[PDB]
Enzyme design. Structure first.
Site, PDB file in Angstrom:
ATOM      1  N   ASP B  25       0.824  -1.212   0.000  1.00 39.02           N
ATOM      2  CA  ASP B  25       0.000   0.000   0.000  1.00 39.02           C
ATOM      3  C   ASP B  25       0.859   1.265   0.000  1.00 39.02           C
ATOM      4  OD1 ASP B  25      -1.870   1.937   0.201  1.00 39.02           O
ATOM      5  OD2 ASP B  25      -2.912   1.108   1.936  1.00 39.02           O
ATOM      6  N   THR B  26       1.017   1.871  -1.178  1.00 37.93           N
ATOM      7  CA  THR B  26       1.754   3.124  -1.294  1.00 37.93           C
ATOM      8  C   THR B  26       1.057   4.294  -0.619  1.00 37.93           C
ATOM      9  OG1 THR B  26       0.736   3.696  -3.423  1.00 37.93           O
ATOM     10  CG2 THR B  26       2.732   2.325  -3.427  1.00 37.93           C
ATOM     11  N   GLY B  27      -0.232   4.187  -0.325  1.00 43.45           N
ATOM     12  CA  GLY B  27      -0.918   5.235   0.396  1.00 43.45           C
ATOM     13  C   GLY B  27      -0.838   5.117   1.900  1.00 43.45           C
TER      14      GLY B  27
HETATM   15  C1  A61 Z   1      -4.782   8.890   4.194  1.00 45.32           C
HETATM   16  C2  A61 Z   1      -4.605   8.036   2.929  1.00 45.32           C
HETATM   17  C3  A61 Z   1      -5.314   6.677   3.028  1.00 45.32           C
HETATM   18  C4  A61 Z   1      -6.835   6.806   3.263  1.00 45.32           C
HETATM   19  C5  A61 Z   1      -7.566   7.099   1.947  1.00 45.32           C
HETATM   20  C6  A61 Z   1      -4.703   5.855   4.182  1.00 45.32           C
HETATM   21  N1  A61 Z   1      -5.129   4.457   4.109  1.00 45.32           N
HETATM   22  C7  A61 Z   1      -4.393   3.572   3.161  1.00 45.32           C
HETATM   23  C8  A61 Z   1      -5.316   3.298   1.961  1.00 45.32           C
HETATM   24  O1  A61 Z   1      -4.604   2.594   1.000  1.00 45.32           O
HETATM   25  C9  A61 Z   1      -6.533   2.487   2.403  1.00 45.32           C
HETATM   26  C10 A61 Z   1      -6.124   1.047   2.768  1.00 45.32           C
HETATM   27  C11 A61 Z   1      -7.412   0.245   3.043  1.00 45.32           C
HETATM   28  C12 A61 Z   1      -7.934  -0.729   2.008  1.00 45.32           C
HETATM   29  C13 A61 Z   1      -9.215  -1.510   2.291  1.00 45.32           C
HETATM   30  C14 A61 Z   1      -9.966  -1.310   3.605  1.00 45.32           C
HETATM   31  C15 A61 Z   1      -9.437  -0.333   4.645  1.00 45.32           C
HETATM   32  C16 A61 Z   1      -8.157   0.446   4.365  1.00 45.32           C
HETATM   33  N2  A61 Z   1      -7.430   2.429   1.275  1.00 45.32           N
HETATM   34  C17 A61 Z   1      -8.752   3.070   1.255  1.00 45.32           C
HETATM   35  O2  A61 Z   1      -9.200   3.641   2.200  1.00 45.32           O
HETATM   36  O3  A61 Z   1      -9.416   2.932   0.008  1.00 45.32           O
HETATM   37  C18 A61 Z   1     -10.741   3.336  -0.127  1.00 45.32           C
HETATM   38  C19 A61 Z   1     -10.866   3.965  -1.435  1.00 45.32           C
HETATM   39  O4  A61 Z   1     -10.878   2.950  -2.260  1.00 45.32           O
HETATM   40  C20 A61 Z   1     -11.649   1.799  -1.496  1.00 45.32           C
HETATM   41  O5  A61 Z   1     -10.804   0.482  -1.630  1.00 45.32           O
HETATM   42  C21 A61 Z   1     -10.324   0.189  -0.253  1.00 45.32           C
HETATM   43  C22 A61 Z   1     -11.142   0.808   0.545  1.00 45.32           C
HETATM   44  C23 A61 Z   1     -11.687   2.107  -0.283  1.00 45.32           C
HETATM   45  S1  A61 Z   1      -5.419   3.765   5.648  1.00 45.32           S
HETATM   46  O6  A61 Z   1      -5.727   2.335   5.588  1.00 45.32           O
HETATM   47  O7  A61 Z   1      -6.553   4.415   6.298  1.00 45.32           O
HETATM   48  C24 A61 Z   1      -3.902   4.069   6.560  1.00 45.32           C
HETATM   49  C25 A61 Z   1      -2.787   3.071   6.491  1.00 45.32           C
HETATM   50  C26 A61 Z   1      -1.522   3.361   7.257  1.00 45.32           C
HETATM   51  C27 A61 Z   1      -1.417   4.667   8.069  1.00 45.32           C
HETATM   52  N3  A61 Z   1      -0.239   5.219   8.938  1.00 45.32           N
HETATM   53  C28 A61 Z   1      -0.645   6.475   9.489  1.00 45.32           C
HETATM   54  S2  A61 Z   1      -2.074   6.798   9.004  1.00 45.32           S
HETATM   55  C29 A61 Z   1      -2.500   5.627   8.123  1.00 45.32           C
HETATM   56  C30 A61 Z   1      -3.800   5.350   7.353  1.00 45.32           C
END
Ligand code: A61
Lengths: 99, 99
Positions: B25-27
């Site tokens: 997860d690059t995000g």
């Molecule tokens: C702040 C930037 C994003 C939120 C946007 C951060 N997320 C990582 C994402 O990759 C998250 C990772 C993720 C994936 C799946 C479930 C819960 C979290 N993906 C996500 O929320 O995606 C949503 C949009 O597309 C949909 O597909 C997945 C869920 C929807 S996270 O899971 O909340 C996350 C991970 C490590 C971390 N370290 C400090 S804060 C922090 C927050």
């Protein structure tokens, strides 16, 4: 380009004719942008993240250019903590993970 | 290897003598894993994403193997709906984004 991950993979995008900064997010299925004005019709939808579910406006078939690469696809608009470019658009610009 | 993004970038990881599946997860700034009873001390932390925040336990200097690539760093443990490998570890295995 090849992007390393010591910093956040933030890039400039163009959507609705406006420049913005967004995060290339391989863990996002969908693209979610913070509150903004977009032309065209939209539909209310729900998306879930790490902390629960939020209400978004779903815009289909939206033109968006990511770091100079064109895409046309779904863009969700709502109270995301940060603008994220998800896999639905990352695939369009030919983005892969490599190690 | 090279991982395309048509589907979620799920890989097998080894942590605490256990194998699990996690997203590259690059995000994700940090690495966040499902509840597991790791030994040693930890510090409380809150991490925010779509939908708000979850409470996690921060463990430091944890050994993790990702596709046979070894790393060591901070791992957050809590009620996350998905295991995510964050940039703190992706940098250590040499992972880049490419388009
Ligand atoms: C702040 C930037 C994003 C939120 C946007 C951060 N997320 C990582 C994402 O990759 C998250 C990772 C993720 C994936 C799946 C479930 C819960 C979290 N993906 C996500 O929320 O995606 C949503 C949009 O597309 C949909 O597909 C997945 C869920 C929807 S996270 O899971 O909340 C996350 C991970 C490590 C971390 N370290 C400090 S804060 C922090 C927050």
């Amino acid at each position: 380009p090849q992007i390393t991950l010591w910093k956040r993979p933030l890039v400039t995008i163009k959507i609705g004719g406006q420049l913005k900064e967004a995060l290339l997010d391989t863990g996002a299925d969908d693209t979610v942008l913070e509150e903004m004005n977009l032309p065209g019709r939209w539909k209310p939808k729900m998306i879930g993240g790490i902390g629960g579910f939020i209400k978004v406006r779903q815009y289909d078939q939206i033109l968006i250019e990511i770091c100079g690469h064109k895409a046309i696809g779904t863009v969700l608009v709502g109270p995301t903590p940060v603008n994220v470019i998800g896999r639905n658009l990352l695939t369009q610009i030919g983005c892969t993970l490599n190690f």
